[PDB]
Design a protein around this ligand. Structure first.
Ligand SMILES: NC(=O)c1ccc[n+]([C@@H]2O[C@H](COP(=O)([O-])OP(=O)(O)OC[C@H]3O[C@@H](n4cnc5c(N)ncnc54)[C@H](O)[C@@H]3O)[C@@H](O)[C@H]2O)c1
Ligand SMILES: NC(=O)c1ccc[n+]([C@@H]2O[C@H](COP(=O)([O-])OP(=O)(O)OC[C@H]3O[C@@H](n4cnc5c(N)ncnc54)[C@H](O)[C@@H]3O)[C@@H](O)[C@H]2O)c1
Ligand SMILES: NC(=O)c1ccc[n+]([C@@H]2O[C@H](COP(=O)([O-])OP(=O)(O)OC[C@H]3O[C@@H](n4cnc5c(N)ncnc54)[C@H](O)[C@@H]3O)[C@@H](O)[C@H]2O)c1
Ligand SMILES: NC(=O)c1ccc[n+]([C@@H]2O[C@H](COP(=O)([O-])OP(=O)(O)OC[C@H]3O[C@@H](n4cnc5c(N)ncnc54)[C@H](O)[C@@H]3O)[C@@H](O)[C@H]2O)c1
Ligand SMILES: NC(=O)c1ccc[n+]([C@@H]2O[C@H](COP(=O)([O-])OP(=O)(O)OC[C@H]3O[C@@H](n4cnc5c(N)ncnc54)[C@H](O)[C@@H]3O)[C@@H](O)[C@H]2O)c1
Ligand SMILES: NC(=O)c1ccc[n+]([C@@H]2O[C@H](COP(=O)([O-])OP(=O)(O)OC[C@H]3O[C@@H](n4cnc5c(N)ncnc54)[C@H](O)[C@@H]3O)[C@@H](O)[C@H]2O)c1
Lengths: 551, 551, 543
């Protein structure tokens, strides 16, 4: 294939980096201006132009323009300046982009499956032109973090996340399939817009909803394979969580809100445990929240303790949960689900009404907040920890920032800089009155999903075990240098997310083979060389035909 | 477009004549054996192989195999050895090929329009992939010369004739469309064959026949234009002749049996008139036959005399016709059609019963036989001419050989080598008893259809006048050299059919412009250079991309 | 995809059998005659046309004509009349067809890699349009059995063999890559030919040649994967045997003339054993030839014996070899390879000068002829075996009839119909004076290469062990029914080559999974169903 098509296909288009010989031999001569440049100077021109613009939204449009024009240039510039541009391509900007610029550019990307297509979903899946899809990321656009129900404009989130699959772990773009399921929207801003690109109905919440996600799962799987990696993104928590439970064993699926959070959470505790060298039986964890997030993080703490010499039942007894109804204790007015049982214990003689009370009586070394209620780590709660512990561990994991349990500012000032703090929220550094400055711990799911996704795909793995995320957690924290642990870092620098994501992938690859969950044989002797060699790269290929004389 | 497709398209395939650089740059390297040859040595290999085989049928299969593989090589070898291979590609072999090898190779070529497709013929025409069809040749396969009703196996005839359009006049192959109309067959050899490729019914002879040919004419014309050249080939004479009359004015159409015969016939008379210098009023023509052939040849004699100083009514009086019912004379038992009127005259006082009688009483300088009855030029008839004339002109034009009015052998022996003889039939040389050898005149429609077709297409002419064939006749005979006229040649050597066909085309081009029947403007100053420059040629083009350094 | 290309593509072209529905839908109405047919009518039409063709060479040209126009129809008619058309498409008439091919017709197919393309073999491999090649057959065409050095015209043989891969074992044609390596030719009649299609040079036998083969192996493997089955065919006996040794551990490779021959020979010997039940102790095998053919048969025989409770070197003691310098014996004047050593034994008191003398002293139960020197199984040799043995086994395997060690005629007559005889030659039935009628066994590599190939591809096997060929030999003989063994058949009928080939593929698949040589996971539970439902078929698809 030669001529114009080479230029209109972003997967092969090199633009001005088309060699003179390439332009002449492939019939491009005259279709480009008469000047050869390299990926280097192409990339340099873009970085320079991005430095002139200041709006994140404007940066999104500019860089997503390239992704449609020149695939390899897009992933060069993305990887050149990854810490700055991960927040532009993905959260928080992608959500802001979808909402505002859905109606104006109207450029279709990925696959749209509406409830109108019940019974014929296989035939919609058959229209996707790529034959070896390895990674599917799907949304119904119900809960875009910090905006809400954006309907089909949700498509932007799977696209953005897949960009990071490629940028961070070098997963092949052609092997990725962003999907948007349209069951309606509850947002009258969209239902009353004559220019809305989605179905004009309230979200279908009937059995037809559950049957369509079922049909989609079957359909993707029947074309691409049983081992096809599937993530649900910005679904309603109730849907996302019950779907993880329904499909986790039948399909190759994992969920960032539960399992990525658990890996990122544990990674941070493990980092905290390297500076504070506090012994295993000196440990007691108290959760604000007892939902799927708490259960997921808790499960992974239990499993970590069991690998370090404790017993499942010993590890469990070091973990307490406090939900809406208060502390979770054997025999109480409020419900206790059978997944919560393992962390529901015999009451201590004092029973608390507030979380503050619960801290004072239990005296935990670590509080983890996953309630999504708001500032429930109140100064009295933060103050009480500083009192009970030399170095208290305070994780305010609830997102977004409004829902977070406490700020970095109020966490560090009220413990006079002695707490080991992490959040999902982006808090800036905080300056105490003695002069010294604290940069808080920022837990980010991008630490986990790229490396995990790459290992599962490269191994042809069909089931993602809890131990994957355990192994992910250890792999992340094992990359913190002794110099970095002394400066109070709980998480590697995002600038190194590539090296980080690949080492996690090598270590999960090692785990999946060692435990007979890989189907890619023969098994490699060296798992490092196996992955470092199957990563997609942004360097331009030669498209030059091989001309040579005959001796 | 590059790679395998270049090789599977016979219009671009060069086979072993693909340059090393072409093979490397276009992605053919390894798809061909590792040896470069030229058209020269390709052509040489074929000629050498054809010399080892002796059956015309075997020569047909071998050479038609190339036409499907390598278009330009096919037209090189065809033109290299044109006198030998015109009879293989076309009549008489093509008819013999169709019959025998229709059922075995079963390779579809050209467009099939069946009576099953009444009302939807435009949509069948729309399936032909070439957009600028200039020349259409169509059969219903009813009367293959010297075989009969071959049904859809008739397709071979239009294909073969189009081969000669290209070989003889350099008309573009891509601009040619062979067509086969299937209305059934009356041949039970085909209707009882389970492997027959055509419709299983007797030929439809109802109004639906006339309506389908109408719909086909409209359809071809509505896609390709009003100026699109159309010939009917091996239709039943009644159909071929009444269709010429119905469409001749509405459409750009001409018929070889009537108009090609008239041009070839007149060309021969004009040649005879250069050696015998017998004056215009010393001339009297007697026809055996008074049908469309006689009328067509007669019309063109009248028009030739009128250009030389006679009057339409004077010229007519020099022409007599003798059909089944005898001599055509004002007031006789038998019918006289209004087209026959002009050559129906007042009776001479003796009235003949036999053609022999008619010769003796009228004493014509020329007898032309177009009756299709058989040996009606009996020795007494041939003898009577030798008696009445120093050099009698005897044209036995009825085809095939069985239907011919007399042989060359019996024509030359019974006039003791004094007759100027021509036939449509291929008679070998004839040796008289005084030693000397006569090569007879062979009239061949290939003298006329290539040159005429090229002029009409190159001029965007919409109507083919009688004067075209007049001009064709003069153009043919004007090419006989004075040396050739002394040896008794009535027709140029077939070995030079290319030069001959192109000069005819130049001279018809001159006529069509001079008489405002051309639509291609601006009109060229020099009509020779206009045609010599628009001829398709068999030389291979370069497909090499233009690689060059930048100064 | 649409219209004319759909007809010009032999993979898709159904010809007259394109349904009205398809024609309406795919823009074919008008491009085809009115008539609509079924594959049954096309095949029947074709079988009739072929029967009035007189020459086996005229037949080749007709059927290969269909192969270039309608691939489905080509494999239908081939499978329909598989026994008669097998020797048309392949051995022997493919060799004769090659001899006078590339002159009159000279259509190109497969992949041509020149010694001129040195260092650029990857370009050429990348020019092959198919993306999922699983089966490569390669030749340099130095040793076409019967004709010899046919240079670049040897391409016809890989093409011939891949046709049998598909016809016999239902290996997908679009996953087959015939390859001809052009390194020059020593054929003088062919170098002087101006219309020859190869390099006008003598065969490059330098290091450049060995490097080219290394580059080919690496190129095929880089594009299509390390799994890719690579089969060498009609290579020089010198190169084929040494390239097998070199590559068979590194890549997924086998050689038909060594490992295929070995497997078919053993299968015959094993069939002979069910008939006569000679106590394994009494077995004594004497080869005419000590070539890599003999070494391949010998290796598989000891593996059979070891598997039936003999120790390795105790089995080797039962096998004697005799070449151009007489019996292979310890401290002999002539030269012995390190692969010939295990079948080189201490000298018996009297050292045989002649093969007859070798038979009388050693008094063997079986004689295997693989010397390609002609009629060395002399009447006196055949009478000796008849006298020493109740049921003597005589295998005359030198392939071209004229250089077979003996005839069925000679074997059955001079043995009073007591001998179990196989050859590689197409000998007819033999009628003795006592009125009994003997049908000699025809050993044919087609019993093995199809089923083995399918199994290795389907199991994503990377190394093909000696045991695969031992298991294939056993799989072949087990196809023989009690009636067939009673009638004294040594091979199953060729008419059933498909069933035979697919049963062999199933047994080899079971062995490969059982011995951790299959890398296709998940492991199937029903191997017979796994293989049967993965075979490509001649049945037209819907478009
Ligand atoms: N590059 C292509 O255009 C292409 C397309 C189809 C097949 N192939 C060939 O087929 C052969 C078979 O593949 P294999 O099983 O050896 O692959 P593999 O064993 O190298 O990889 C194991 C699995 O991971 C996938 N994979 C590998 N690298 C990846 C990446 N960067 N992103 C996402 N997924 C990735 C594969 O599809 C496979 O499912 C390969 O040798 C390849 O050359 C190539
Ligand atoms: N903005 C968003 O898009 C969004 C929405 C929902 C959840 N989330 C995040 O995802 C996670 C999933 O939450 P979930 O589905 O388990 O919610 P849930 O209500 O099912 O469970 C959350 C837990 O917090 C507890 N809780 C609620 N209010 C409380 C209070 N005032 N005091 C103490 N405990 C209280 C609940 O009892 C429960 O145990 C949350 O941690 C949240 O950070 C984000
Ligand atoms: N060669 C191609 O692929 C192609 C296709 C379409 C259009 N064109 C271009 O469109 C322009 C317009 O054409 P034009 O009106 O000047 O043509 P023209 O005036 O040279 O020819 C007059 C007519 O005769 C036809 N013609 C010319 N040479 C012919 C041949 N060898 N056989 C049969 N028919 C022949 C033309 O189609 C036209 O109808 C041309 O300059 C040409 O380059 C080229
Ligand atoms: N074999 C074939 O495929 C075939 C078939 C028909 C015609 N042709 C040729 O095409 C031409 C067209 O013929 P047509 O359609 O005008 O036929 P027609 O019958 O319409 O006219 C032929 C003329 O010959 C005359 N004729 C017939 N028998 C005669 C006899 N015994 N004596 C004197 N005159 C006699 C007729 O009266 C008539 O004037 C013929 O000249 C013939 O050579 C060939
Ligand atoms: N189970 C069935 O009924 C059935 C039948 C036909 C195809 N399939 C296909 O098999 C797929 C499974 O994936 P896979 O292709 O990796 O496993 P597979 O079992 O189809 O592959 C086995 C190996 O042999 C190859 N192969 C299979 N059939 C072949 C043939 N006839 N000729 C040559 N090579 C052949 C394959 O490329 C692969 O390397 C399914 O997605 C399905 O589409 C399944
Ligand atoms: N069984 C089958 O279906 C099958 C298949 C393919 C090939 N073959 C045959 O395998 C044979 C291999 O032999 P090759 O010709 O390639 O030579 P080779 O070098 O492979 O082996 C021939 C052996 O015979 C010996 N030899 C030569 N002349 C001799 C003589 N007069 N007496 C005793 N020994 C002699 C040689 O020294 C050598 O040891 C071929 O003849 C070929 O026809 C058989």
């Amino acid at each position: 294939e030669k001529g114009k098509p080479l230029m209109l296909n972003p997967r092969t288009n090199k633009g001005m980096a088309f060699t003179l010989q390439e332009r002449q031999m492939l019939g491009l001569q005259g279709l480009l201006p008469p000047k050869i440049e390299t990926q280097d100077i192409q990339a340099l021109q873009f970085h320079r132009n991005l430095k002139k613009m200041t709006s994140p939204l404007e940066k999104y449009i500019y860089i997503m323009g390239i992704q449609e024009r020149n695939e390899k240039l897009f992933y060069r510039i993305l990887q050149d300046d990854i810490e700055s541009l991960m927040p532009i391509v993905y959260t928080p900007t992608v959500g802001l982009a979808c909402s505002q610029y859905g109606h104006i550019f109207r450029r279709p990307k990925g696959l749209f499956i509406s409830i109108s297509d019940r019974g014929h979903v296989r035939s919609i899946v058959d229209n996707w032109p790529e034959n070896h899809v390895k990674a599917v990321v799907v949304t119904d656009g119900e809960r875009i973090l910090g905006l809400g129900d954006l309907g089909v404009y949700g498509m932007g989130i799977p696209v953005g996340k897949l960009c990071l699959y490629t940028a961070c772990a070098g997963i092949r773009p052609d092997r990725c399939l962003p999907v948007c399921i349209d069951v309606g929207t509850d947002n009258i801003a969209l239902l009353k817009d004559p220019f809305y690109m989605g179905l004009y109905q309230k979200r279908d919440r009937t059995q037809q909803y559950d049957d369509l996600i079922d049909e989609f799962m079957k359909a993707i799987t029947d074309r691409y394979g049983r081992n096809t990696l599937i993530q649900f993104e910005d679904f309603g928590n109730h849907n996302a969580f019950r779907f993880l439970r329904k499909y986790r064993e039948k399909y190759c699926t994992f969920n960032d809100d539960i399992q990525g959070t658990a890996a990122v959470a544990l990674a941070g505790l493990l980092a905290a445990q390297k500076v504070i060298s506090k012994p295993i039986s000196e440990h007691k964890i108290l959760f604000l929240g007892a939902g799927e997030a708490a259960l997921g993080i808790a499960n992974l703490i239990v499993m970590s303790m069991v690998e370090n010499g404790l017993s499942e039942q010993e590890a469990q007894k070091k973990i307490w949960m406090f939900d809406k109804y208060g502390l979770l204790v054997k025999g109480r007015k409020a419900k206790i689900d059978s997944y919560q049982e393992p962390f529901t214990h015999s009451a201590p003689e004092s029973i608390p009404d507030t979380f503050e009370d619960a801290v004072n009586i239990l005296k935990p070394s670590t509080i983890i907040g996953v309630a999504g209620a708001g500032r429930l780590f109140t100064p009295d709660v933060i103050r009480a920890m500083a009192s009970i512990n030399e170095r208290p561990v305070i994780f305010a994991l609830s997102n977004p920032t409004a829902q977070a349990e406490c700020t970095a500012e109020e966490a560090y000032t009220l413990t006079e800089g002695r707490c080991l703090f992490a959040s999902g929220s982006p808090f800036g550094p905080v300056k105490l009155t003695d002069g010294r400055v604290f940069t808080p711990g920022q837990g980010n799911n991008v630490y986990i999903f790229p490396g995990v996704a790459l290992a599962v795909i490269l191994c042809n793995t069909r089931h993602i075990s809890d131990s994957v995320f355990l192994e992910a957690a250890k792999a992340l924290t094992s990359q913190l240098t002794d110099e970095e642990l002394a400066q109070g870092r709980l998480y590697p620098p995002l600038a190194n997310i590539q090296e980080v994501s690949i080492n996690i992938a090598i270590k999960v690859t090692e785990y999946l083979y060692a435990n007979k969950m890989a189907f890619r044989y023969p098994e490699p002797e060296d798992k490092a060389k196996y992955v470092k060699e199957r990563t997609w790269r942004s360097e331009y290929d030669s498209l030059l035909p091989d001309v040579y004389e005959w001796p």
